[PDB]
Amino acid sequence: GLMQFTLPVRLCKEIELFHFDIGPFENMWPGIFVYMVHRSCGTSCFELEKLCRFIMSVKKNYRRVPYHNWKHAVTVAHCMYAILQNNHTLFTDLERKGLLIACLCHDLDHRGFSNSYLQKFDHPLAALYSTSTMEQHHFSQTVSILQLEGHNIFSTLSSSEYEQVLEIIRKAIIATDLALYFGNRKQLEEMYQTGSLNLNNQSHRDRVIGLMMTACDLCSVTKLWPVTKLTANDIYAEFWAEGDEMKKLGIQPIPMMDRDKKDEVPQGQLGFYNAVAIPCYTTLTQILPPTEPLLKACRDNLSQWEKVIRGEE
Ligand SMILES: Cn1cc(-c2ccncc2)c(C(=O)N[C@@H]2CCN(c3ccc(Cl)cn3)C2)n1
Ligand SMILES: [Mg+2]
Ligand SMILES: [Zn+2]
């Protein structure tokens, strides 16, 4: 009950900002997660012992990949923490619980390869789950860990509440399949512009939560430029590895995954900003006005990639 988590002064103040970087000290990240749960959810939300064990079993189930790793998980959960803290009254006790856990679990057991590559490889997972292949696997790994002895962090919920939170988690993890993002954001754009967006409508809440998941997943593009630039190295380290595995299947990869084409990266980034990132944060800011600092930072990074292209860096 009375056993609070306390960060050092700099992290105490900066953890509240959208552009917070969790740091290189891996042993501090569990603690930073529990801190976020306690302030976002309460000190009564989860049994500490159950939560600690759960977190450690989650960490162990992320692989040693350049980008889709334990650090990405914690980084996505922080961006959701920042959203939820800036939007106190909008979300239910169940949603706050579920969404931090969904963010921590969203890339469980990622091998660093796209849905596309699994399907072209003919991976077993592409037979078990024909769409959102990796995301259905992430949800299936999340249920696994929740079902280890001592790892049921939701044990104090009723049967029906437990079913709702696992449905919040299922939808939130599926929503991280970027292929689903474009149509979701368009639906949200019309609903907002025609003033029919209704947050008591559950089908509507699910779409807004979907877009929050995309926002949190892409939050690399919302950091300060030195963080954004160095994070791009880890992302393209996985893209080029996949490119290499495509070329082993006898398939020319897209330029995004071809290391021979590292020259076209700065133009590649502008398209991403213009086609995904800026639209994602713009729509998020219309629906949830206090998430504007995400759109501001993303625009700052677009300007930096236009300077790279101009050779101002
Ligand atoms: C799934 N996802 C996440 C990210 C992400 C996230 C955070 N920082 C950066 C990229 C991207 C992403 O950058 N992808 C675009 C899509 C096209 N692309 C090209 C295209 C041609 C060349 Cl030569 C180089 N990159 C970059 N895609
Ligand atoms: Mg993913
Ligand atoms: Zn992710």
Q: Where are the domains of the chain?
A: 28-310
Tell whether the torsion through CA atoms of 68, 36, 216 and 167 is positive or negative: positive
Which ligand is closest to the CA of 134, given by its number? 2
> Is 106 one of the annotated binding-site residues?
yes
**CA–CA dist 208, 272 (Å, integer):** 21
Which ligand is closest to the CA of 269, given by its number? 1
Q: What is the DSSP letter of 252?
A: P
**CA–CA dist 116, 262 (Å, integer):** 21
Alpha-carbon distance values, 31 to 22, 25, 52, 157, 272 (Å): 11, 11, 9, 24, 33
Ligand 3 centroid to residue 310 C-alpha, Å: 31
Nearest residue by C-alpha to atom 16 in ligand 1: 272
Using left for φ > 0, alpha for ψ between -120 and 50, and beta otherwise, residue 157 falls in beta
> Is 252 one of the annotated binding-site residues?
no
Chain-centre distance of CA 236, in angstroms?
17
Reported as half-sphere exposure (CB side, CA atoms, 13 A), residue 257 has a value of: 18
**CA–CA dist 104, 74 (Å, integer):** 6
Nearest residue by C-alpha to atom 9 in ligand 1: 232
Q: How many CB atoms lie within 10 A of CB 263?
A: 9
Give the position, in ligand 1's atom list, of the atom nearest the Cα of 261: 23
> Is 136 one of the annotated binding-site residues?
no
Ligand 1 centroid to residue 226 C-alpha, Å: 17
Q: H or E stretch including 81? A: helix 70-86
Beta carbon of 255 within 6 Å of any ligand 1 atom: yes
How determined? Answer: X-ray
In single-letter form, the type of residue at position 276 comes to: V
Nearest residue by C-alpha to atom 11 in ligand 1: 272
Using left for φ > 0, alpha for ψ between -120 and 50, and beta otherwise, residue 42 falls in left
Task: Quote the Cα angle for 42-43-44, to 5°.
Answer: 90
Ligand 1 centroid to residue 181 C-alpha, Å: 15
Identify the CATH number of the domain defined by range 28-310: 1.10.1300.10
> Is 138 one of the annotated binding-site residues?
no
Ligand 3 centroid to residue 195 C-alpha, Å: 31
Nearest residue by C-alpha to atom 3 in ligand 1: 218
The candidate with the shortest Cα–Cα distance to 142, out of 113, 187, 172, is 172
Q: How many CB atoms lie within 10 A of CB 114?
A: 17
Reported as half-sphere exposure (CB side, CA atoms, 13 A), residue 207 has a value of: 22
Beta carbon of 76 within 6 Å of any ligand 1 atom: no
Which ligand is closest to the CA of 214, given by its number? 3
Ligand 3 centroid to residue 218 C-alpha, Å: 7
> Is 151 one of the annotated binding-site residues?
no
